């Protein structure tokens, strides 16, 4: 809210009295953590995206899961998602232990809704399923790359107070598709731990209800862990409580 | 062999012994999952 | 553009050295003949290669760098009975003229001289140079190249260099009397020009349209052309591709390996498509002796017959329908399972199957 | 992959061709002393450090004009009582392999210096040397190609552009004793052609002349020579008499009180030598 | 005469919304229902898209007939005007949402809905656990990697700083949003087309969780 101080001489009773409004310190605080966390997320989607070109493919991203034909390609860019989150939770880890394996399914009636990517193990090693027609579909829906998405008081401070500064392929477009394959590897890659350190029935349990996540994460992710990507904002369903009471 | 060059992986005589000797890559990545082995060498 | 006629310009690849025989008195009205001669040249330093000693039939002759007078049309230059001119590789327009014919010389053939009624044309075997674009080269002062004329006539690896203040038309007229004298060397000569690549390409066009005027004054076709910076990226491209080292294969060369393709398949080498295709943003037609038709980029076609025959020459619906073109597409997609990057395109033919 | 195909993206470049030097044994770890002045795209292809350390020498600037021009210079590092060999400012071609002691320094900036000096047989020598030496094939080709290969640009980027300024004629230089009435002057133009286009360029950009005709105007900046140009290279050496005193006051009551905050002439000795001329500005 | 060119543009807008195939968020009205439909009419090429959705008018809770050559021309025609990559599903996707938009209301507030009534039997998620994953059982694995291996972070810090210069001038909040609605919409599609109940709630969830994880 609001302070006050007070200066005064010690010999001396003439005090001067000044109020301090603490909403311009707020306003500061809110436009510093902002940039240090857009800072953060943007270093790691560069991050992302370099590394996916260190594996130096030609293709660019969609392209490549276009490309049925070309599992290859596909498997490793998903296994260097997946070990790049992994790493993102678990700083010292740079490998993955354990080889893995990587189908890619190309049917409905084997895809299954909600889970692009998903786990199982052939009781001697882990495979991870692949729903290709999926990933194509999420990465070719078109965006919107014209709307803006958003106390009014403090929104025009920060406009006021804030500035603004008027040979990669990347536009936002192709931005977007790799946040969209990072978050999807993402929300994959908590499934696998939960699995991993909860047994296939709490995997299952979890696939059911990711509310489980809660506590089987934030046991050790809020704790020790970069916070989630999604935590850069609050997500909702617009209309959500009559959608629900549908 | 010896002589006056020194000590020499050389043969007395005919041709010499046969002497024969992670960075994720595309390549790395394997393919499907899926001679004289019971032998020590 | 009007020329007046009282100018008479001859473009010859010899004058990148001043004609000194060619000069003779003009007459005036009187025919009375003009002992006094002024040679215009494009820069001073020129002034230092004419010999005054070489004008017997002149008792003064005088020489000073032509310079664009703002303040005269060159629709009517001022005329100077006192004197006969002479202008030697001009590059402003001519506002002056002397008794009789103003006399000009040059190796270059810009728009004010392109229509000049009174043009003479030398003609000359072709001999071509040697383009060597590559970062034990010999220096010339393209500027001067007159100064260099021994090394420009003896060796054979030139490093062209132009001061930095020099301007676009002397480019053009060193880099034309350089190539002049090369059209004179008996062995052609490897030369790279220390200039941007943007700039040597407007040069190389505007050579090119040079040579066009001098075409339509009726000059000889040469073959010694050059090549756009982009058209020997894709050389290089090609020859890289196919194993070639640079320095060991010329362009020309590189070309000329598909003429065996040319004729006995009828085919049109992809290396001359593109480069036609380079050329058009700066259609192929050709055919042999005694032959009846003419082999093109379109593919056959009857001689003196439009590069495409009537439209409704072959019936395409057949197959040149969605439901055939879909069908073929799925059917490759199946049995190749695929799922991108597969086109399919009805075949159209033009006079000939 | 993220970049267009292709597409050569745009960024610094370190300039000091000794910034390439590494251990060509893999299994030793090396870093070069690269002053940070090697990041800018100006006319020196050396950084200070290396400068300092191989030819005795520190870049300056010489402000010149209405619009205040910079002109590059270099100055001397050698002391007064230095003699000899010492006094080589920058050795020749006939004399670096000597001045410079290859056998104590690392194979990498041998092949440098050989490849500076237009020493082809030195550079064959290391090369085939290299090729019969250690696991060349498993790493130490592709490094050794590599130093190659940029010192190569380098070379390729100067002497081109060297060549067409000696045969220039707007701009002239003439690194000699204008002082023709003297004698460790001589023939200072040729020795200097003698010189390889690269080092043409560095002694360009270090050594100032005593005088600069622009246009019709004349900035006489020394009533002498600072140095000289022999067989040997460049010297740090007076050519009328006895050495200028070069404290070296840095890197390797009653007066104070009157000398407080107070301008101070500086006892650096520039480079100063030769004739030069120009035609317009150029700049 | 009516703006053809209008009439197409907010065609194609309405029919990018109702097919999901554009996060792009935007208001819509009769007048672009208007717009769109006599668009199909005057357009000889969209003929039998504009019979289909008229064919909505009716109980619309049918599957309409047609031969394997009128498919075809259907979605070459729908893939022409979207510029795309399409399947049949749209298609049906596009009827069931027209269909509900022309039988719903005139109504002074939009009505927000989802996806429903796409390719009969209700199946739950534990249903499609079941079978799904008997039948990636089965599958085998097209390819794998070894043990341990090394993730293959880049080193070009000047590359990474190129990068990040080239990615500043994108608003985080529109790549979020756009990211989040892509994946949103491929799920209901796929919840859609297979006939089992969207859970909203659990969808919900997965934003709770990152927040409760987030407030820790
Ligand atoms: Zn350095």
């Not at chain 1, 490793?76 to 232990?97: D, E, G, Q």
């Not at chain 1, 990347?170 to 790799?178: G, K, M, P, R, W």
């Not at chain 3, 060597?132 to 260099?148: D, G, K, Q, V, W």
């Not at chain 5, 968020?25 to 009769?30: A, D, L, R």
Request: with cysteine.
């Amino acid at each position: 809210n609001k302070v006050r101080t007070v200066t005064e001489i010690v010999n001396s009773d003439e005090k001067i009295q000044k109020t301090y409004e603490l909403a311009e310190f707020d306003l500061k605080n809110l436009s510093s953590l902002e940039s240090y966390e857009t800072l953060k997320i943007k270093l790691a989607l560069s991050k992302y995206m370099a590394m996916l070109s260190t594996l130096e493919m030609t293709q660019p991203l969609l392209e490549i899961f276009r490309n049925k034909a070309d599992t290859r390609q596909i498997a490793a860019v998903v296994f260097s998602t997946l070990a790049f989150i992994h790493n993102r939770f678990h700083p010292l880890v740079t490998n993955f232990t354990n080889k893995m394996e990587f189908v890619v399914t190309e049917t409905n009636d084997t895809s299954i809704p909600g889970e692009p990517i998903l786990f199982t193990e052939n009781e001697g090693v882990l495979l991870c399923s692949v729903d290709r027609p999926s990933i194509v579909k999420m990465l070719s829906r078109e965006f919107d790359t014209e709307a803006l998405v958003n106390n009014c008081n403090v929104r025009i401070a920060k406009t006021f107070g804030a500035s603004k500064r008027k040979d990669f392929s990347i536009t936002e477009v192709e931005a977007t598709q790799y946040l969209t394959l990072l978050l999807t590897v993402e929300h994959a890659y908590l499934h696998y731990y939960i699995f991993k350190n909860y047994g296939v029935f709490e995997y299952c349990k979890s696939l059911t209800d990711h509310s489980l996540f809660t506590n089987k994460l934030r046991s050790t992710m809020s704790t020790k862990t970069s916070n989630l990507l999604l935590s850069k904002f609050k997500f909702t369903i617009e209309d959500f409580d009559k959608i629900n009471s549908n | 062999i010896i002589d006056e060059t020194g000590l020499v992986a050389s043969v007395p005589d005919g041709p010499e012994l046969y002497n024969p000797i992670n960075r994720l890559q595309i390549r790395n990545v394997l393919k499907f999952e899926g001679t004289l082995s019971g032998y020590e060498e | 553009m009007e020329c007046p006629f009282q100018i008479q310009v001859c473009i010859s690849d010899r004058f990148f050295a001043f004609p000194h025989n060619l000069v003779e008195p003009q007459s005036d009205v009187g025919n009375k003949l003009i002992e006094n001669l002024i040679v215009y040249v494009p820069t001073d330093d020129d002034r230092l290669y004419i010999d005054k000693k070489q004008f017997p039939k002149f008792n003064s002759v005088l020489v000073y760098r032509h310079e664009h007078d703002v303040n005269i049309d060159s629709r009517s230059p001022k005329k100077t009975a006192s004197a006969t001119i002479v202008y030697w590789n001009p590059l402003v327009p001519i506002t002056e003229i002397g008794a009789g014919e103003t006399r000009v010389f040059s190796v270059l053939l810009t728009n004010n001289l392109f229509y000049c009624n009174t043009m003479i044309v030398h003609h000359e075997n072709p001999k071509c140079p040697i383009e060597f674009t590559y970062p034990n080269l010999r220096p010339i002062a393209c500027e001067i190249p007159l100064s260099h004329f021994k090394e420009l006539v003896e060796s054979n690896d030139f490093l062209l260099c132009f001061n930095l203040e020099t301007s676009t038309m002397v480019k053009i007229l060193s880099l034309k009397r350089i190539f002049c004298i090369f059209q004179y060397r008996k062995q052609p000569a490897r030369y790279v020009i220390n200039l941007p690549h943007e700039e040597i390409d407007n040069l190389y066009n505007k050579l090119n349209w040079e040579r066009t005027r001098r075409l339509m004054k009726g000059d000889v076709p040469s073959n010694c052309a050059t090549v756009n910076r982009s058209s020997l990226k894709y050389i290089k491209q090609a020859q890289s591709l196919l194993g070639i080292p640079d320095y060991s294969q010329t362009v020309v060369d590189f070309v000329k390996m598909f003429q065996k393709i040319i004729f006995p398949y009828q085919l049109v080498p992809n290396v001359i498509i593109k480069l036609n295709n380079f050329d058009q943003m700066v259609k192929i037609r050709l055919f042999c002796k005694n032959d009846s038709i003419a082999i093109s980029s379109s593919g056959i076609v009857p001689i003196n017959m439009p590069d495409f025959s009537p439209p409704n020459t072959f019936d395409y619906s057949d197959y040149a329908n969605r439901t055939n073109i879909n069908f073929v597409t799925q059917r490759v997609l199946t049995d190749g399972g695929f799922s991108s990057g597969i086109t399919v395109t009805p075949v159209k033919y033009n006079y000939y199957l | 992959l993220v970049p267009v195909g292709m597409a050569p993206r745009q960024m610094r470049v370190n300039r000091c061709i000794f910034a390439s030097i590494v251990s060509f044994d893999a299994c030793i770890t090396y870093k070069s002393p690269c002053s940070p002045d090697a990041y800018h795209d100006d006319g020196w292809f050396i950084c200070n450090n290396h400068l300092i350390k191989r030819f005795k020498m520190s870049k300056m600037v010489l402000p010149i004009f209405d619009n205040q021009f910079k002109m590059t210079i270099a100055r001397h590092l050698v002391g007064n009582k230095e003699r000899g060999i010492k006094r080589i400012l920058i050795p020749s071609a006939t004399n670096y392999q000597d001045v410079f002691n290859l056998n104590s320094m690392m194979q990498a900036e041998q092949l440098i210096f050989h490849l500076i000096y237009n020493n082809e047989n030195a550079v064959n020598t290391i090369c085939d040397n290299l090729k019969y030496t250690e696991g060349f094939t498993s790493n130490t080709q592709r490094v050794i190609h590599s130093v190659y290969a940029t010192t190569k640009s380098i070379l390729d980027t100067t002497n081109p552009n060297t060549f067409c300024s000696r045969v220039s004629r707007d701009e002239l230089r003439f690194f000699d004793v204008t002082n023709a009435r003297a004698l460790r002057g001589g023939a200072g133009d040729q020795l200097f052609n003698n010189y390889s286009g690269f080092l043409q360029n560095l002694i360009r950009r270090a050594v100032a002349p005593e005088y600069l005709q622009i246009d019709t105007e004349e900035l006489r900046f020394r009533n002498c020579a600072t140095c000289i140009i022999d067989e040997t290279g460049l010297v740090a050496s007076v050519p009328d008499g006895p050495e200028l005193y070069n404290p070296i006051r840095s890197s390797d009551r009653e007066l104070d009180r009157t000398l407080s905050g107070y301008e101070e002439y500086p006892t650096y000795v520039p480079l100063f030598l030769g004739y030069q001329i120009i035609n317009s500005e150029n700049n | 005469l009516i703006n053809m060119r209008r009439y197409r543009n907010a065609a194609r807008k309405l029919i990018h919304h109702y097919s999901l195939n554009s996060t792009s968020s935007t208001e819509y009205k009769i007048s672009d229902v208007v717009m769109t439909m006599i668009f199909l009419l005057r357009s000889e090429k969209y003929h039998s898209l504009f019979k289909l959705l008229e064919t909505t008018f009716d109980d619309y809770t049918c599957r309409p007939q047609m031969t394997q050559v009128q498919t075809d021309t259907l979605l070459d025609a729908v893939r022409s005007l979207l510029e795309m990559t399409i399947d049949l599903t749209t298609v049906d996707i596009m009827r069931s949402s027209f269909a509900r938009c022309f039988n719903s209301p005139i109504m002074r507030y939009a009505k927000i809905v989802l996806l429903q009534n796409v390719a009969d039997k209700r199946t739950t998620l534990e249903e499609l656990l079941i079978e799904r994953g008997e039948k990636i059982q089965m599958l085998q694995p097209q390819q794998y990697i070894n043990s341990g291996t090394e993730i293959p972070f880049c080193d070009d810090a000047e590359f990474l700083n190129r990068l990040l210069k080239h990615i500043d001038p994108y608003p985080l909040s529109r790549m979020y949003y756009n990211a989040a609605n892509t994946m949103f919409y491929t799920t209901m599609e796929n919840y859609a087309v297979s006939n089992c109940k969207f859970n909203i709630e659990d969808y919900n969830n997965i934003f709770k969780v990152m927040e409760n994880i987030r407030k820790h």
